Amino acid sequence: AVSKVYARSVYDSRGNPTVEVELTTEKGVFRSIVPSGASTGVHEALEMRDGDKSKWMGKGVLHAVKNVNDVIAPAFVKANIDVSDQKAVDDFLISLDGTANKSKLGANAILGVSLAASRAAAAEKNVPLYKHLADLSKSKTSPYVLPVPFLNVLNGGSHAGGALALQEFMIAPTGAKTFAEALRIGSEVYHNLKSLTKKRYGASAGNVGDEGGVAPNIQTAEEALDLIVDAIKAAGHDGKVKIGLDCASSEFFKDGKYDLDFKNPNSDKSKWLTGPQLADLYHSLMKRYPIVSIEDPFAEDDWEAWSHFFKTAGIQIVADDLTVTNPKRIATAIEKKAADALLLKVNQIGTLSESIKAAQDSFAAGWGVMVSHRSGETEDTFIADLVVGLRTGQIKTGAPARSERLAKLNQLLRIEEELGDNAVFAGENFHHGDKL
Amino acid sequence: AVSKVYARSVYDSRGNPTVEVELTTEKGVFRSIVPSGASTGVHEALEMRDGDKSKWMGKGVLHAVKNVNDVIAPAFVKANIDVSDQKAVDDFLISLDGTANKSKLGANAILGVSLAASRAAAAEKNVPLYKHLADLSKSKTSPYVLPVPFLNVLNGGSHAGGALALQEFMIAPTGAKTFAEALRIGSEVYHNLKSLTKKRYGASAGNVGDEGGVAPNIQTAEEALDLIVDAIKAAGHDGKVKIGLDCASSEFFKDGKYDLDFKNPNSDKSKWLTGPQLADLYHSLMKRYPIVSIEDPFAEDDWEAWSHFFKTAGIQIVADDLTVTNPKRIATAIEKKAADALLLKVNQIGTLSESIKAAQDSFAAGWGVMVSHRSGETEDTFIADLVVGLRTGQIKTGAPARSERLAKLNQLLRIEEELGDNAVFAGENFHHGDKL
Ligand SMILES: [Zn+2]
Ligand SMILES: [Zn+2]
């Protein structure tokens, strides 16, 4: 049984505080580290920030730490809950909170305990975490599916100077035969990308953003896409590597229109595009480049632009700001046929049970699921076991640079090695990895 | 006893392959991950790289992995060595290699096994790794000393565009009272530094180098030092935070002279400085800024410039490229009075025993020891327990950004919490933390 629950403050990949939870059982101490999330959030679970400008720039998690230590811990020990019954753990946490967006205790305090329990349940059951996570989600286990990693290589929009409004350019080595191969291939494209970048834009152009990709001063989408196609080519992996985009269009949505030069800041309003004109630009890009996935193509409440686009897209369309891992939000997206893949961010909903529940509903509607990292990550490898337990066949966990990213990619290499012949690489079937 | 030894290839913070070793005993599986090192090296232990340009850009470690699996493992199991006898483990590894620079098996293959053993010895002894490492080095344990972190915030030289020839600017919160405080303070200076940088040099200026600091296009040392003094000021930590430099002067040493504008590339040769003129520029800097440590002020074989400088420096002088963690090199440095602190890079010598031996000799000569990270780090936290076991009172493990860096800083926070009153923060006595 659980004899102790403790929380301490530690730091995320950006140097901002985050919550670390330690759970003690008769089998040892189990720990989890929460990724940074939102402290203000409609439709999303809110993490709790101290807000004291005189400490950590107002990003402490001292309260959140107190909620775990002074509130949950005492209650949790007394409840004497079976960690194996994940739903029981989560229903307990939720009831303790009593808010819909975990704003009383904080999503950060709750998640930390929710993930540590699953670690402790695995230990107790004597199986690898991915296997316990597969038990919980009632996923097929013969074979297990290793996912295609969607590696961030280049960033624009709010994460770069230059005129480029699209936010993230990813490469996906769908052509590989094992996870180890896709990771090698992906790292070689990445390294060629850096060489080219430093050569065409300067030494500075070689530094990395929060997730590990470059941020040269780029003017257009073609410009960026051309750079990546050169890097794929230069690495000799043409045909084996596809492109993924994250438009994060909520960022340049203004007055019912889309401003492709939003950094302008004298943006010719005559050039803003309507949903349909935007869909024509994506169609163009899609014809010239090997794009297989497009995330957040339209704004988070622009329902009709999604539906319209969806009808003729023909590639995977990922909902991220549109669904913010919110089931009420997912059901609507499903009903409106706005997309066919969900970006899953466990800390956006706050509990393991609700995160598994959100993927199950997506799967039932024929949607694929892309498990995802946060901007402010940690050394914790939880999402690697989660992607395999869920059998989604696709993960977005950054570039092949910075260990908060590589920790997860390194964990996928171990799992693959351990499964032997009981594992298959999703490949070209990343979309529907669950039905493989 | 040791029943198994396995190695697998995994990735470092830069996306380049590295060796991971797993050691099995009756107490479980113990793992270590080696930082990337040198494959070509005079005076240093050489790690082994596959060199096959068609895979990982010729940086595979497949051979190194084979050396562990096919060569050491079989021999190691049969030798039936006590992991508690660290010297016995290391003498065994070394004898198996039979070269002076571990060029037959590779420093990367050997270190991986050398560090995993110490993990397994701790387990067996039932103590925290730092405590086992203190037992091995015959270090004082009452109290334990937590170190002042020398955080990289800004880089120049070969790591940046601009004319600035000095390579690394560090902040050291010697004024803090606990490790947790120094880390908070340090992160707040860092974050202010980023805000200022992005404001004065542009959004791009905000991206990070391999270690987590910024790399704006800076022209002079005063320029950079002025920026940091503003960030300290803006964070409100004036007086509590000091500056550390890493000149990496081997990089602009040419024709017996120092070229401060080596990126020139029309460097006015009339402006190159002799050792003594260079010492006058450092003296200047030292008078205007709160500099408490200077690493590699003169070139790696410029013996007389070191001695001369040393005589009137009055602050800590760190040997890094001068000693390359080589004891023959350290003895000479000691005898010539070229410096009074050693940068310790375990993978530069290849074994735990030799790394402890190199620190012990430094200490005996009255030198301080700065435990250090590599450019290509991992999620492994070994150097955090090492810095505490050695009682050095100072560590250089990057900026408070990128988890290959924060993993170590996060590990120091846990150790501090666990020691309670049995721990002291080195503070202003970082230099001689060992004699505290
Ligand atoms: Zn997104
Ligand atoms: Zn150095």
PDB file of N, CA and C in Angstrom, chain A residues 5-10 16-22 32-39 45-52 56 58-74 93 96-97 101-114 347:
ATOM      1  N   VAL A   5       3.534  10.137   0.284  1.00  0.00           N
ATOM      2  CA  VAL A   5       3.413  10.994  -0.898  1.00  0.00           C
ATOM      3  C   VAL A   5       4.100  12.333  -0.597  1.00  0.00           C
ATOM      4  N   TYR A   6       5.109  12.650  -1.368  1.00  0.00           N
ATOM      5  CA  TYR A   6       5.860  13.907  -1.126  1.00  0.00           C
ATOM      6  C   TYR A   6       6.028  14.696  -2.388  1.00  0.00           C
ATOM      7  N   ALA A   7       6.147  16.010  -2.384  1.00  0.00           N
ATOM      8  CA  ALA A   7       6.363  16.804  -3.593  1.00  0.00           C
ATOM      9  C   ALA A   7       7.488  17.774  -3.208  1.00  0.00           C
ATOM     10  N   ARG A   8       8.270  18.146  -4.185  1.00  0.00           N
ATOM     11  CA  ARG A   8       9.393  19.050  -4.061  1.00  0.00           C
ATOM     12  C   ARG A   8       9.408  19.885  -5.332  1.00  0.00           C
ATOM     13  N   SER A   9      10.074  21.027  -5.271  1.00  0.00           N
ATOM     14  CA  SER A   9      10.104  21.877  -6.501  1.00  0.00           C
ATOM     15  C   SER A   9      11.382  21.545  -7.272  1.00  0.00           C
ATOM     16  N   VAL A  10      11.285  21.369  -8.594  1.00  0.00           N
ATOM     17  CA  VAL A  10      12.503  21.089  -9.394  1.00  0.00           C
ATOM     18  C   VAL A  10      12.394  21.943 -10.650  1.00  0.00           C
ATOM     19  N   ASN A  16      12.338  26.892 -15.532  1.00  0.00           N
ATOM     20  CA  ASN A  16      11.197  27.387 -14.721  1.00  0.00           C
ATOM     21  C   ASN A  16      10.851  26.234 -13.779  1.00  0.00           C
ATOM     22  N   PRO A  17      10.452  26.537 -12.546  1.00  0.00           N
ATOM     23  CA  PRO A  17      10.054  25.514 -11.569  1.00  0.00           C
ATOM     24  C   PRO A  17       8.897  24.648 -12.062  1.00  0.00           C
ATOM     25  N   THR A  18       8.891  23.435 -11.517  1.00  0.00           N
ATOM     26  CA  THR A  18       7.832  22.474 -11.831  1.00  0.00           C
ATOM     27  C   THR A  18       7.767  21.537 -10.633  1.00  0.00           C
ATOM     28  N   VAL A  19       6.669  20.791 -10.616  1.00  0.00           N
ATOM     29  CA  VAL A  19       6.437  19.853  -9.526  1.00  0.00           C
ATOM     30  C   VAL A  19       6.963  18.438  -9.834  1.00  0.00           C
ATOM     31  N   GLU A  20       7.666  17.906  -8.841  1.00  0.00           N
ATOM     32  CA  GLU A  20       8.197  16.567  -8.775  1.00  0.00           C
ATOM     33  C   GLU A  20       7.430  15.803  -7.666  1.00  0.00           C
ATOM     34  N   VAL A  21       6.885  14.625  -7.867  1.00  0.00           N
ATOM     35  CA  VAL A  21       6.153  13.908  -6.805  1.00  0.00           C
ATOM     36  C   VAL A  21       6.851  12.584  -6.524  1.00  0.00           C
ATOM     37  N   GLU A  22       6.921  12.188  -5.274  1.00  0.00           N
ATOM     38  CA  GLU A  22       7.546  10.905  -4.909  1.00  0.00           C
ATOM     39  C   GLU A  22       6.500  10.087  -4.161  1.00  0.00           C
ATOM     40  N   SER A  32       7.544  11.093 -10.436  1.00  0.00           N
ATOM     41  CA  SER A  32       7.090  11.625 -11.718  1.00  0.00           C
ATOM     42  C   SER A  32       7.473  13.117 -11.679  1.00  0.00           C
ATOM     43  N   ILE A  33       7.607  13.644 -12.889  1.00  0.00           N
ATOM     44  CA  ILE A  33       7.955  15.081 -12.984  1.00  0.00           C
ATOM     45  C   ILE A  33       6.979  15.582 -14.051  1.00  0.00           C
ATOM     46  N   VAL A  34       6.272  16.612 -13.693  1.00  0.00           N
ATOM     47  CA  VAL A  34       5.261  17.232 -14.563  1.00  0.00           C
ATOM     48  C   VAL A  34       5.887  18.266 -15.492  1.00  0.00           C
ATOM     49  N   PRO A  35       5.448  18.269 -16.730  1.00  0.00           N
ATOM     50  CA  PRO A  35       5.847  19.228 -17.741  1.00  0.00           C
ATOM     51  C   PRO A  35       5.150  20.548 -17.386  1.00  0.00           C
ATOM     52  N   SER A  36       5.683  21.666 -17.864  1.00  0.00           N
ATOM     53  CA  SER A  36       5.003  22.967 -17.540  1.00  0.00           C
ATOM     54  C   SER A  36       3.777  23.033 -18.451  1.00  0.00           C
ATOM     55  N   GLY A  37       2.684  23.599 -17.970  1.00  0.00           N
ATOM     56  CA  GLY A  37       1.387  23.800 -18.585  1.00  0.00           C
ATOM     57  C   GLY A  37       0.837  25.220 -18.552  1.00  0.00           C
ATOM     58  N   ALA A  38      -0.466  25.366 -18.411  1.00  0.00           N
ATOM     59  CA  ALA A  38      -1.187  26.645 -18.377  1.00  0.00           C
ATOM     60  C   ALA A  38      -1.686  26.952 -16.963  1.00  0.00           C
ATOM     61  N   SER A  39      -1.576  28.201 -16.554  1.00  0.00           N
ATOM     62  CA  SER A  39      -2.027  28.616 -15.205  1.00  0.00           C
ATOM     63  C   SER A  39      -3.333  29.390 -15.400  1.00  0.00           C
ATOM     64  N   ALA A  45      -7.122  22.210 -18.060  1.00  0.00           N
ATOM     65  CA  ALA A  45      -6.783  22.013 -16.659  1.00  0.00           C
ATOM     66  C   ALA A  45      -5.679  23.059 -16.441  1.00  0.00           C
ATOM     67  N   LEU A  46      -5.784  23.742 -15.309  1.00  0.00           N
ATOM     68  CA  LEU A  46      -4.858  24.803 -14.944  1.00  0.00           C
ATOM     69  C   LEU A  46      -3.842  24.367 -13.926  1.00  0.00           C
ATOM     70  N   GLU A  47      -2.580  24.660 -14.223  1.00  0.00           N
ATOM     71  CA  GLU A  47      -1.563  24.316 -13.200  1.00  0.00           C
ATOM     72  C   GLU A  47      -1.503  25.582 -12.334  1.00  0.00           C
ATOM     73  N   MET A  48      -1.125  25.427 -11.095  1.00  0.00           N
ATOM     74  CA  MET A  48      -1.011  26.506 -10.129  1.00  0.00           C
ATOM     75  C   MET A  48       0.441  26.994  -9.920  1.00  0.00           C
ATOM     76  N   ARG A  49       0.541  28.273 -10.189  1.00  0.00           N
ATOM     77  CA  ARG A  49       1.689  29.143 -10.107  1.00  0.00           C
ATOM     78  C   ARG A  49       1.581  30.096  -8.923  1.00  0.00           C
ATOM     79  N   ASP A  50       2.646  30.239  -8.141  1.00  0.00           N
ATOM     80  CA  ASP A  50       2.644  31.153  -6.998  1.00  0.00           C
ATOM     81  C   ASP A  50       2.369  32.597  -7.443  1.00  0.00           C
ATOM     82  N   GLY A  51       2.787  33.115  -8.575  1.00  0.00           N
ATOM     83  CA  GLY A  51       2.493  34.496  -8.967  1.00  0.00           C
ATOM     84  C   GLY A  51       3.230  35.616  -8.236  1.00  0.00           C
ATOM     85  N   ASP A  52       4.186  35.261  -7.400  1.00  0.00           N
ATOM     86  CA  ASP A  52       5.039  36.184  -6.611  1.00  0.00           C
ATOM     87  C   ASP A  52       6.231  36.640  -7.452  1.00  0.00           C
ATOM     88  N   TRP A  56      11.390  33.536  -8.724  1.00  0.00           N
ATOM     89  CA  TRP A  56      11.263  32.801  -9.983  1.00  0.00           C
ATOM     90  C   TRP A  56      10.443  33.501 -11.047  1.00  0.00           C
ATOM     91  N   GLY A  58       7.712  34.913 -10.666  1.00  0.00           N
ATOM     92  CA  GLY A  58       6.291  34.648 -10.373  1.00  0.00           C
ATOM     93  C   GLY A  58       5.839  33.289 -10.878  1.00  0.00           C
ATOM     94  N   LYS A  59       6.794  32.382 -11.111  1.00  0.00           N
ATOM     95  CA  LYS A  59       6.455  31.061 -11.623  1.00  0.00           C
ATOM     96  C   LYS A  59       6.727  29.973 -10.612  1.00  0.00           C
ATOM     97  N   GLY A  60       6.784  30.279  -9.329  1.00  0.00           N
ATOM     98  CA  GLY A  60       7.022  29.230  -8.323  1.00  0.00           C
ATOM     99  C   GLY A  60       5.825  28.278  -8.381  1.00  0.00           C
ATOM    100  N   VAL A  61       5.994  27.154  -7.707  1.00  0.00           N
ATOM    101  CA  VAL A  61       4.999  26.071  -7.643  1.00  0.00           C
ATOM    102  C   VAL A  61       4.956  25.605  -6.187  1.00  0.00           C
ATOM    103  N   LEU A  62       5.372  26.528  -5.319  1.00  0.00           N
ATOM    104  CA  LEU A  62       5.383  26.322  -3.871  1.00  0.00           C
ATOM    105  C   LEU A  62       3.991  25.953  -3.322  1.00  0.00           C
ATOM    106  N   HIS A  63       2.956  26.530  -3.866  1.00  0.00           N
ATOM    107  CA  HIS A  63       1.573  26.277  -3.398  1.00  0.00           C
ATOM    108  C   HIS A  63       1.162  24.861  -3.815  1.00  0.00           C
ATOM    109  N   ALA A  64       1.432  24.680  -5.112  1.00  0.00           N
ATOM    110  CA  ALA A  64       1.184  23.368  -5.766  1.00  0.00           C
ATOM    111  C   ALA A  64       1.907  22.316  -4.935  1.00  0.00           C
ATOM    112  N   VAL A  65       3.138  22.572  -4.502  1.00  0.00           N
ATOM    113  CA  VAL A  65       3.873  21.618  -3.671  1.00  0.00           C
ATOM    114  C   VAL A  65       3.198  21.369  -2.317  1.00  0.00           C
ATOM    115  N   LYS A  66       2.615  22.397  -1.772  1.00  0.00           N
ATOM    116  CA  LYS A  66       1.885  22.416  -0.492  1.00  0.00           C
ATOM    117  C   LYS A  66       0.584  21.627  -0.618  1.00  0.00           C
ATOM    118  N   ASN A  67      -0.099  21.796  -1.699  1.00  0.00           N
ATOM    119  CA  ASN A  67      -1.346  21.073  -1.979  1.00  0.00           C
ATOM    120  C   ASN A  67      -1.105  19.576  -1.923  1.00  0.00           C
ATOM    121  N   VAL A  68       0.053  19.125  -2.431  1.00  0.00           N
ATOM    122  CA  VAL A  68       0.370  17.707  -2.447  1.00  0.00           C
ATOM    123  C   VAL A  68       0.761  17.240  -1.044  1.00  0.00           C
ATOM    124  N   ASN A  69       1.671  17.956  -0.437  1.00  0.00           N
ATOM    125  CA  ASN A  69       2.186  17.631   0.873  1.00  0.00           C
ATOM    126  C   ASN A  69       1.184  17.804   2.022  1.00  0.00           C
ATOM    127  N   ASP A  70       0.524  18.954   2.026  1.00  0.00           N
ATOM    128  CA  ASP A  70      -0.422  19.215   3.123  1.00  0.00           C
ATOM    129  C   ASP A  70      -1.838  18.712   2.860  1.00  0.00           C
ATOM    130  N   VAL A  71      -2.253  18.653   1.610  1.00  0.00           N
ATOM    131  CA  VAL A  71      -3.627  18.219   1.333  1.00  0.00           C
ATOM    132  C   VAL A  71      -3.880  16.830   0.825  1.00  0.00           C
ATOM    133  N   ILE A  72      -3.311  16.478  -0.319  1.00  0.00           N
ATOM    134  CA  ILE A  72      -3.514  15.151  -0.911  1.00  0.00           C
ATOM    135  C   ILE A  72      -2.876  14.028  -0.126  1.00  0.00           C
ATOM    136  N   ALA A  73      -1.598  14.144   0.176  1.00  0.00           N
ATOM    137  CA  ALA A  73      -0.836  13.136   0.890  1.00  0.00           C
ATOM    138  C   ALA A  73      -1.547  12.538   2.099  1.00  0.00           C
ATOM    139  N   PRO A  74      -1.923  13.404   3.032  1.00  0.00           N
ATOM    140  CA  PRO A  74      -2.603  12.923   4.259  1.00  0.00           C
ATOM    141  C   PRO A  74      -3.866  12.153   3.879  1.00  0.00           C
ATOM    142  N   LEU A  93      -8.478  11.732  -6.768  1.00  0.00           N
ATOM    143  CA  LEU A  93      -7.850  13.043  -6.912  1.00  0.00           C
ATOM    144  C   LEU A  93      -8.831  14.137  -7.324  1.00  0.00           C
ATOM    145  N   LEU A  96     -11.247  15.215  -4.715  1.00  0.00           N
ATOM    146  CA  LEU A  96     -10.532  16.018  -3.720  1.00  0.00           C
ATOM    147  C   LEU A  96     -10.444  17.471  -4.173  1.00  0.00           C
ATOM    148  N   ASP A  97     -10.388  17.664  -5.499  1.00  0.00           N
ATOM    149  CA  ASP A  97     -10.292  18.965  -6.132  1.00  0.00           C
ATOM    150  C   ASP A  97     -11.671  19.649  -6.214  1.00  0.00           C
ATOM    151  N   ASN A 101     -11.639  22.178 -13.803  1.00  0.00           N
ATOM    152  CA  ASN A 101     -10.371  22.479 -14.462  1.00  0.00           C
ATOM    153  C   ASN A 101      -9.197  22.418 -13.502  1.00  0.00           C
ATOM    154  N   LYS A 102      -9.410  21.641 -12.497  1.00  0.00           N
ATOM    155  CA  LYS A 102      -8.465  21.365 -11.421  1.00  0.00           C
ATOM    156  C   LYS A 102      -7.780  22.597 -10.864  1.00  0.00           C
ATOM    157  N   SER A 103      -8.574  23.659 -10.813  1.00  0.00           N
ATOM    158  CA  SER A 103      -8.122  24.955 -10.334  1.00  0.00           C
ATOM    159  C   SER A 103      -8.037  25.156  -8.831  1.00  0.00           C
ATOM    160  N   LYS A 104      -8.558  24.231  -8.046  1.00  0.00           N
ATOM    161  CA  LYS A 104      -8.492  24.352  -6.589  1.00  0.00           C
ATOM    162  C   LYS A 104      -7.153  23.798  -6.131  1.00  0.00           C
ATOM    163  N   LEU A 105      -6.751  22.600  -6.506  1.00  0.00           N
ATOM    164  CA  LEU A 105      -5.469  21.999  -6.076  1.00  0.00           C
ATOM    165  C   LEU A 105      -4.348  22.245  -7.096  1.00  0.00           C
ATOM    166  N   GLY A 106      -4.737  22.330  -8.345  1.00  0.00           N
ATOM    167  CA  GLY A 106      -3.869  22.549  -9.493  1.00  0.00           C
ATOM    168  C   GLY A 106      -3.584  21.244 -10.251  1.00  0.00           C
ATOM    169  N   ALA A 107      -3.753  21.266 -11.541  1.00  0.00           N
ATOM    170  CA  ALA A 107      -3.466  20.154 -12.479  1.00  0.00           C
ATOM    171  C   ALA A 107      -2.056  19.572 -12.304  1.00  0.00           C
ATOM    172  N   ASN A 108      -1.113  20.424 -11.950  1.00  0.00           N
ATOM    173  CA  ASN A 108       0.300  20.108 -11.703  1.00  0.00           C
ATOM    174  C   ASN A 108       0.452  19.284 -10.436  1.00  0.00           C
ATOM    175  N   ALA A 109      -0.304  19.617  -9.404  1.00  0.00           N
ATOM    176  CA  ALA A 109      -0.235  18.831  -8.158  1.00  0.00           C
ATOM    177  C   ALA A 109      -0.875  17.454  -8.346  1.00  0.00           C
ATOM    178  N   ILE A 110      -2.007  17.455  -9.032  1.00  0.00           N
ATOM    179  CA  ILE A 110      -2.783  16.226  -9.282  1.00  0.00           C
ATOM    180  C   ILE A 110      -2.138  15.226 -10.243  1.00  0.00           C
ATOM    181  N   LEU A 111      -1.670  15.715 -11.384  1.00  0.00           N
ATOM    182  CA  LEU A 111      -0.994  14.893 -12.374  1.00  0.00           C
ATOM    183  C   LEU A 111       0.208  14.197 -11.762  1.00  0.00           C
ATOM    184  N   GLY A 112       1.036  14.944 -11.037  1.00  0.00           N
ATOM    185  CA  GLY A 112       2.235  14.398 -10.404  1.00  0.00           C
ATOM    186  C   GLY A 112       1.917  13.125  -9.631  1.00  0.00           C
ATOM    187  N   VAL A 113       0.800  13.095  -8.883  1.00  0.00           N
ATOM    188  CA  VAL A 113       0.368  11.950  -8.076  1.00  0.00           C
ATOM    189  C   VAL A 113      -0.258  10.854  -8.949  1.00  0.00           C
ATOM    190  N   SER A 114      -1.020  11.266  -9.944  1.00  0.00           N
ATOM    191  CA  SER A 114      -1.654  10.366 -10.906  1.00  0.00           C
ATOM    192  C   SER A 114      -0.626   9.544 -11.710  1.00  0.00           C
ATOM    193  N   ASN A 347      -0.992  16.639 -19.389  1.00  0.00           N
ATOM    194  CA  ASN A 347      -1.101  17.742 -18.419  1.00  0.00           C
ATOM    195  C   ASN A 347      -2.150  18.746 -18.906  1.00  0.00           C
TER     196      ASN A 347
END
